Amino acid sequence: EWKRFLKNNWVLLSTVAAVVLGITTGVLVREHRNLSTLEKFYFAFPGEILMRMLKLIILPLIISSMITGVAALDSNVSGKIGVRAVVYYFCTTLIAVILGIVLVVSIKPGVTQVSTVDAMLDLIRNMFPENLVQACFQQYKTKREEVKPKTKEYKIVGMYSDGINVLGLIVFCLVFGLVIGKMGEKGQILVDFFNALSDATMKIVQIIMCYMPLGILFLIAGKIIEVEDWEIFRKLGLYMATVLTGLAIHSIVILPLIYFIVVRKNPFRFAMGMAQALLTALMISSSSATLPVTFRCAEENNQVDKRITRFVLPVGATINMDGTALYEAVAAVFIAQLNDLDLGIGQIITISITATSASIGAAGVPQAGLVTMVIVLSAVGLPAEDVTLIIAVDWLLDRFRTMVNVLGDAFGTGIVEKLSKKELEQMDVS
């Protein structure tokens, strides 16, 4: 049993092997030959091809996947027992993103030891672009300049700068998906077309992630060829500390507080019954294959009605990801702080909207998480190549992210139980 193991375990092993081979070839190149500025650009060329292929695919991905995500979510949601679960999912994902932003701008890993009305108005001017083909490559930006023919007079001009407009595409695909989902039968050809387009785009994302380790080997080798002071590793350690304390105070202080103020019962006697599901979600690292274990730990080990467990858990296994959203907020602001750049408050809200609204179009392919980390890095215009310093860390944080996703939608079945106590008697009587 040798080729079977490397058949089943090739993502984690190729990522770890690429990290260690890249670090050892960077050390063996640096302490044996000094490279100039030109040949440090030809050495990090497979990484350039990988960071081009990752940006090539995000446009049909965030069109087709967002359209089918919101159409299938509209199809699944039925009564007023399917509204409360969606509201719960999106409130806790927003709370997780806000906690991650507060923690990453308070701890500050990565820093070494004009009005704010125009940003908040360009945030709304970019949700409704003036052209829909041009939204696939250029954004808006307004600038307050001074007109002169005792007080100053001002005038606002606008210019279309380069870079994709993820907020306008997210908003238009949300509205278009709701419209073609509620059209019924006359817009079933559109749902079929965008569903097959989403499948064919997830397969190309899997092809790119088959190429990926040969790219991040050269990117890691080219990112320790300029190192001198042993100091970027402390920035990585502080980023791990920020993500782990964000998950540790999101799954202890916030979610049991939500359970206590809604249900008015003890959250820890609830969460002690989910121990098999949480240890399983740590061991197998996916929150959709630990679904039967959390089925038999909520209907049996607690006392939850199956009529709500048959809805909340299969929906929340795909669209309720608190830990991934907190991770993407913390990682985007950490990449911004690593490049000697201070974000505004239009950029923080763009990160905070693109991190929770990219949970809707979540199929079930765990590779595309990396593509989501490019999308929130490309909604605000940050250089994507520094995401290499996240991927080398990403195999040590996936376990706890899966644990917090499972804990969020396992608390959801307790939340939606108390709110919908009339409708369960209505489905019991008739």
Next chain:
Amino acid sequence: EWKRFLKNNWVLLSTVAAVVLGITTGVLVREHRNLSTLEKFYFAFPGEILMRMLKLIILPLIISSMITGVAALDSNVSGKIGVRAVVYYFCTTLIAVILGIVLVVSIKPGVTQVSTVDAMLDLIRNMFPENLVQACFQQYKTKREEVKPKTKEYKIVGMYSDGINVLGLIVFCLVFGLVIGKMGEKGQILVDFFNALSDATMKIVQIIMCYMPLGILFLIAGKIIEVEDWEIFRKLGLYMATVLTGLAIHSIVILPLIYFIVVRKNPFRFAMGMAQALLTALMISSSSATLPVTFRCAEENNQVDKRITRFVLPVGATINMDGTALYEAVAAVFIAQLNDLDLGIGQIITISITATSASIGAAGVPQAGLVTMVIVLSAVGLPAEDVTLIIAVDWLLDRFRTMVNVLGDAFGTGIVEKLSKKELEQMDVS
């Protein structure tokens, strides 16, 4: 019976209420606080968001709606009794547009009391763009410059300026719609795809028109905050006079003359039999819901064969709109004259082609008339925000436009009767 009335009547009431609340808040703001140049730009911001949302939707609208319009018109047209009706519709729509252009450049409302070969050649260079994705945001423009190493030597250069190319998209969607309509069975998937895309785009146009009154309230308030001399209201009165005399000499002098030179019978004894249909089209303001009344006033109150009435009236209720085309020509040249701008003769023919060829893709949603008024304002590059001064007037001219649409296709059943007298005996004998 109170909430039922405001349920059935909410378009006219929200438009009128937005107009009067905008005028009273502009008067109450102007005579109580003086605003600078900067805070006159933040006051007209919901209007900016509305004029962005109106431009966001015109590209999938004029692609999908033109394709399904010309494909369904090709499907409906059968023999040589279905050719004459289409030729009649397009000749009278062109005559109405030409009469509107002549009247608006002769009366001139809105004015206060390089060769012309290169424009006419850019008009043909813009019907066949050199790229089809770039036609969704940029147009061509040629400039005759002078080369110098006794008579002058010249040379033509070309540059792609910004702004959508409505003429190239209209021509390509007309040819593409005819091709996939005549392909039969192998191109039925394309007709289904673009038909569902047209439905899903009309629903987003209805969503935008649900937002509209909150936008035109602030646009009207921001357009009487710069007023001083009581003079733009006289320009509005002259625009109403031009549209009403255009309809009054199109439905008295031109259409009865066409009837007299084709049929050689009295047009007024014909039109006196359509009195119930004309008063109905005034009372209910839509020319597709007054269709049974004009059915029973042409087959009964006159003497028209039903074999031509069953074709001409259901087709001409959607694609034969003379009054709307005259209105859009007069309103586009009035918006050009209001902004101290003299149009050329390439721009007048672009207005005159986009006004009659946007009657083909007419589904049956009466909101999208406003979107058509943006399209002819965006084929020639005029600022769209001044269309606010049309919308406040638009509830006083819709009745007479519906009356002239009904009168045009009611004269059509008399026209096509005399021309096709052999084919009716051929359908009677066999």
Next chain:
Amino acid sequence: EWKRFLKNNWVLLSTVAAVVLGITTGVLVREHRNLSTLEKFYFAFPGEILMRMLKLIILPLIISSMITGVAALDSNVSGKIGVRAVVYYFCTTLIAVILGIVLVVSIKPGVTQVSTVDAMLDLIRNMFPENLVQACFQQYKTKREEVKPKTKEYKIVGMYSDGINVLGLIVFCLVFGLVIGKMGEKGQILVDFFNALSDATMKIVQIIMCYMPLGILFLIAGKIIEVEDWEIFRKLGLYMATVLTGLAIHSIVILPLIYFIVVRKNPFRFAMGMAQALLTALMISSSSATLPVTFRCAEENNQVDKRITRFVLPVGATINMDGTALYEAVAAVFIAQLNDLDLGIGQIITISITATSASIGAAGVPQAGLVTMVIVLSAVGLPAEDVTLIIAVDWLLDRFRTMVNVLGDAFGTGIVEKLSKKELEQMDVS
């Protein structure tokens, strides 16, 4: 029998009539009136409209036709007897393109009697664009510049210059076609959509080629209005000599050598049995209507198993075109040499990749060959209007190109016979 002949023969007759009427009107205009620089630009205006319409159509053509070509080729290929035919087709098409490039840069018709690493790296940077909508109009270009705060220090910058990116669209449509062809049943709506889009694009190419002779009449008239020295006709004669010697040493020296080193039998006793098929492919000038004649000349006049002839000949009649690929390579480098331009080695490999990979999406419409000659002229950014000087020659080289296409796929049935001798006994035993 007069109108029947001009019904069946209108492509060759309109091309020849346009050539002779254009030459006689250029001679009658030049020796009777001298034109300035400005009115030499209005005389060649229908040619400008034709060269705009030819560029308008290449984007949906190379998207939809490449997708359906590689999906249908994936569907047809079954066992290991369908792999060897595809490998044979693409190796001989590459050998033909390489022979054409060597012959055209060695003979040099058309000439009158920065690193090369950055070009070869932009060749790979253009196969994976950073945006997919922007790949429909702009390409990448890197430039090695010098940074200055004894040896020089350099730094590579990049800029997106204008012009369509045929290499990125070809690579993405190849990967997308393979993915939606191997998805099976869940991506059949995509195969149907792109198949109907390919049919509707071939019909618009036939409409443009109905317009074509009125365009090339004025282009030929405007290209002999600047002639003085009788010297461009010698360049045309040398281009004919280069294409004819390329076909003459591709169908005598290379293809019988491939047959001799694979089959180890005499190629001329094989090719003497194909005499009826070769004379037929000369007389009727299409290699897909001479298919039954080469069916009955390989299974009967030789001794080829029908189980391989029923696969190799219907596939190789559409995707195996050696003579057309050699012609397009020679013609693109000849158009480059005619405009006083020396190609690099990124541009020669772009021509050499776009010439063999545009044989995959080959439906069966013989007009679109001209559109392929624009595509390889637009992957490297050459002025397309000089393709007029190819079209006037193109009716004298089509016969021999059809002969070499038929000879290539007729040698293929002898090649694939010897390689697959085990599988034929496996299909005979069971």
